[PDB]
Amino acid sequence: GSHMEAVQNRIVEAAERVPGVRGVIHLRARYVGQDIWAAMIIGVDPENTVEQAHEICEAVQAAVCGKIRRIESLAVSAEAREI
Amino acid sequence: GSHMEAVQNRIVEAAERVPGVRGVIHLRARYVGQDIWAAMIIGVDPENTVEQAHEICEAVQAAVCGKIRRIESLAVSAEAREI
């Protein structure tokens, strides 16, 4: 089941190129029919505001849903990640 | 099924008395055996930091699990709420 490993990779790469994302902490993805439904946690600067972290999450969603073909549901939340 | 409405009320009141919580936005609660498992979204100042919002969520968890008897699982996340 490695068509899923390929896709997870592209999702991770896609997300990380959005401003403010410091790593994908967590990504769950499953096939629903021919579609992918995913849920993601991104690391963000602990000192970003809550409203900034929301904006980053939305940009990640737009970027991934925009770029990655079979993704039809993506939930994105944020956690503090110091690096 | 109104032993659940009573408990949801006490959870909401409990959470709202934690510093930085501006309303409970969402609370899902279910009985697992004789226990309650719940998941909650609190409103917080959009200008709090991410790390502050984490701390508020943890204080809500400590407060609710500490005070409300049959709750054995509580997940708490934060969303921006301007008021």
Numbering used by the authors:
A (entry chain A), B (entry chain A): 211 to 293
Report text from the authors:
One group of metal ion efflux transporters that regulates metal ion homeostasis and can be found in all domains of life is the Cation Diffusion Facilitator (CDF) protein family. One of the most highly conserved and abundant integral MM proteins is the CDF transporter MamM. MamM was recently proposed to function as a magnetosome-directed iron transporter required for iron biomineralization since its deletion abolished magnetite biomineralization and mutation of residues within the conserved TMD metal-binding site resulted in alterations of magnetite crystal size, morphology and even mineral phase. To summarize our results we present an alternative model for the CDF CTD mode of action, in which we propose that upon metal cation binding, the CTD induces conformational changes towards a tighter and more compact fold which allows the activation of iron transport through the TMD.
